[PDB]
């Protein structure tokens, strides 16, 4: 009943307060930050620019890359007054963008679900990654991972007829043979930062304050490089998620 919104808050009632009624509440857990975000969701896909026997090289094709950034937020070959520089590794973008004329598909990669619904300012967690084959041919593929901020080491094949990506002390994966088609695994919160920005970082990324405003540095879970004969759908999963400082969700269009 009667109250005062001015003070920053109000009585949070149930039927029994103003009327001859009562609390109808039942136990229920499924609405918890952790449990809720703890399910798999696609953010993009990987397409090999080259064989399992050669030297790897950044490669784009119809918005598809042979390498991808592990973050919920939007990403893509770095943008430029003259167009996204496709000869390079993807980076975090500040907005979502149509692949072409019509809205879909998207040029950018990201967790659309998480974007349309991230009721919070900061978050953190571990990331469980799943890489599933889109094709039906006996697979021969190599996958390389690296933590946020690490050298891409996108150098030349040392050993002929073998995959350059496999040539590293970093965590790499080798998948090959009939029936062997999906890669699954989990990586640690590997960022230099204490917590990550769910949406926006109200500051410059460089000391000169001239560049990339709104994007926090190393605000991601590292990245993936692929090589071999198979393209794959890539999904992420929020492990032991934690969120802070509540904020507004993505706007929804009012009915005409």
């Amino acid at each position: 009943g009667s109250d005062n919104a001015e003070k920053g808050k109000v009585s949070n009632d149930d039927a029994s307060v103003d009327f001859v009624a009562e609390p109808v509440k039942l136990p229920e857990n499924q609405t918890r930050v952790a449990f809720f975000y703890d399910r798999a969701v696609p953010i993009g896909m990987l397409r090999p620019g080259q064989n399992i026997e050669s030297t790897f090289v950044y490669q784009e094709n119809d918005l598809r890359l042979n390498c991808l950034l592990l973050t919920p937020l939007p990403s893509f070959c770095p943008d430029s007054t003259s167009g996204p520089v496709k000869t390079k590794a993807p980076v975090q973008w500040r907005w979502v963008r149509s692949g072409g004329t019509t809205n879909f598909p998207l040029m950018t990669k990201q967790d659309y679900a998480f974007l349309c619904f991230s009721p919070f300012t900061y978050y953190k967690c571990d990331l469980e990654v799943t890489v599933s084959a889109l094709g039906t041919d006996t697979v021969a593929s190599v996958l390389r991972w690296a933590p946020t901020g690490a050298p891409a080491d996108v150098t030349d094949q040392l050993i002929g007829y073998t995959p350059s990506l496999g040539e590293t002390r970093n965590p790499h994966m080798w998948l090959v043979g009939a029936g062997n088609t999906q890669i699954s695994f989990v990586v640690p919160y590997n960022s230099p930062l204490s917590v990550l920005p769910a949406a926006w970082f109200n500051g410059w990324s460089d000391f000169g304050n001239t560049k990339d405003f709104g994007v926090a540095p190393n605000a991601d879970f590292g990245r993936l490089w692929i090589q071999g004969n198979t393209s794959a759908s890539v999904r992420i999963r929020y492990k032991k998620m934690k969120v802070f400082c509540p904020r507004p969700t993505l706007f929804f269009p009012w009915p005409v």
């Binding site: 918890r32 952790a34 449990f35 640690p188 919160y189 032991k240």
Partner: peptide, 25 residues
């Protein structure tokens, strides 16, 4: 707390399965 419901849920040691939580101060 999260979406995990398996009993035999150890196999890999805890410290390997998850980032290690530690408090600066």
């Amino acid at each position: 707390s999260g979406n995990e419901g398996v009993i035999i849920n150890n196999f890999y040691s805890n410290q390997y399965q998850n980032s290690i939580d530690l408090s600066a101060s």
